[PDB]
């Protein structure tokens, strides 16, 4: 139902401090090897007056390597698909809510995402564009009410050193009953590998591998 | 610049658990007496599969009675106007982010609002439609960085008694420097005074009066 | 059971960033008029290396004026008494947990309080002693599981202007079933009216009056 | 300064919903291999009317295996030592604040800990004793202001399945400047390996290993 090589399209719209924007992306990768790559274009509201980094993790949870002994909640949701709902709380008080809807047509995945972010302070690092990508991260995942819940302590690298913290809570909602995983983790690295001067165009590479708890 | 009787139009769109909707409203009242009334129509995505109450407070901060001894931040923002950015955190984990943009053309105010709400649990009171309006509330307001910040502990009455708590944080952003108020409160009552069977149409009445701290 | 003039004793111990301290106080006032006054001494761990203001609201909920039409949960708890449990979350990340136990012997109230506060940053206003008393405040109060729950958005005035925000959540637990109040507010002003140079001795005056919602 | 085999003593006192308790413990292990074991006795306030599990993670951060390429902030703090300050936020609203002070005398470590926990609801799993140990966990660690900050999404297993979530924030404060680590993780498993009927006596085994991010 999901082939070992897949493509995908991303339509993302939203607001940041009330500034509207649209993004489109084309991506590809190996759903079973955990790798993927995507090229995004700001099609409306560019150049963005805020850091691109807040949008990069919104742009492919089907592309996560599960070992055969951990039920892969999101792959099983197919072909009906799944949604996800996400809250990001930044340490200087900014909050975003983001939702995704994922569908499949052949060997193309389609993600529709809505992004709403606000209370980024005018002198903070998102609005001054002082961020330099995300540390690699590790999401704690567990099953509840037939849903998959993910908690991630994320951090943006800052220009001139140190970190700007963001907590992620992501709820994954299959459109049909599936076989629920036990308690586990997903390790990710997200990199911007190319971009133009004003981030109206961007390319990213992500690796994500699920695993059992490392110790015991 | 603001007459003692004013009308207004509301265009509100957004998502709740990823369900898209549009609302339009026509309202009127006495900006200096703190009273106002509005009739709303769900123009898209109706009937809504969630409680209307989560949307009612999104639908007119110009209509707040200030005593002459408290600078009225929002009226002064006119005619350039103002925006506001709002986070609502519900005690069962749901969060919404909402932004408004307010403009003026003659004696009509126009509010454009975007609403993004999610992680309302499927058996909770918003999705089961068990709520029965908001308690009257009192918002703590103070000045910082040229902005007005409002904190409100809100509560929805529940069918069969008790309360469902929601915290509001609202940041009001004038589009030009204005004269900043000191520390103060705004008391509100919001009532649904008419509606049809499925809340595709709704009418509301609100009173809001600013005051100094009651004791000392 | 509670006379119209009452005295009280306060024994408070705790830690702030791990620094242990003990306070004792002697207080008096009119439980039915909402007024009271208390003199506190730092009996151990003085002079304190942090702002006294974080301790001032820990030092008499029996002394709150209720109108006859609002059940007074805390007075009814007597003579068995009551406890309260409190969480304070400061906007720069510091948190305290505080519990009180209140007993009565004749016309003396006795409050035993434990205070635990930490993650006050070393350059923040509590540890640099930059605070200048609390704004007057207004606590939203409601009944649940036979308990009284109070939510308060508090603010400390800062040296050189502006505010340092603290959210209070206080749960009041009668030691026997009592008649539960409806949804209401309590307005307070707390003032330090005298002190010595290093706040090893302090005197405070508080007024608190319960009321119904002001508007509607 | 720290030998490859070490012993330790724990004195812990505190309150839970205002119930006072004291614990003492004797422990031993291999500070460089990440292993350790400890036997605890409730010396005052036993039997405890709440789940022991809330106390088990308070009872040895010197015993963490660092690879040679990650500065070990806590070992370097010796012999002056270190403190830590911790906030635990449980998903049903309970909060604890905990502080530790660690000293060294020869080849014995001494931990003094204070524990303050409250708003555990009377029918929740801590007060009904429905918990069954902690999932293995993984703490995100980073340097800021000369301090080490740790964020952990923890979970208690429940009787009859599912999880009760607790977020940990722990700040580690060396008593002298040390060489600061980069961004890293510590994986732990904490097990109760023996206990008597009412948890007045308890034995625990913990493994903790620091590592770099797994992916990239
Ligand atoms: Cl802001
Ligand atoms: Cl499940
Ligand atoms: Cl990542
Ligand atoms: Cl949900
Ligand atoms: Cl200002
Ligand atoms: Cl209201
Ligand atoms: Cl700190
Ligand atoms: Cl009740
Ligand atoms: Cl106060
Ligand atoms: Cl409780
Ligand atoms: Cl540092
Ligand atoms: Cl653990």
Numbering used by the authors:
A (entry chain A), B (entry chain A), C (entry chain A), D (entry chain A): 7 to 65, 69 to 225
Which sentences did the original study use to describe this structure?
The resulting proteins, Rtms5Y67F and Rtms5Y67F/H146S, have green fluorescence emission (, 508 nm), and are the first FPs reported that have both green emissions (500–525 nm) and a phenylalanine in the chromophore tripeptide. Each of the protomers in Rtms5Y67F and Rtms5Y67F/H146S consist of the same 11-stranded β-can motif typical of members of the GFP-superfamily of proteins. Located at the core of the barrel is the circularised tri-peptide QFG chromophore maintaining covalent links to Cys65 and Ser69 of the main-chain.
Compared to Rtms5Y67F, the structure of the Rtms5Y67F/H146S chromophore is less well defined with B-factors higher than the side-chains of the surrounding residues. A simulated annealing omit map shows that compared to Rtms5Y67F, the Rtms5Y67F/H146S chromophore is not well-defined in the electron density. Nevertheless, sufficient electron density exists to enable the modelling of a trans, non-coplanar Rtms5Y67F/H146S chromophore. The analysis suggests that the trans conformation of the Rtms5Y67FH146S chromophore is favoured. Our data for Rtms5Y67F/H146S show that contact between the benzylidine moiety of the chromophore and the side-chain of Arg197 prevents a coplanar conformation.
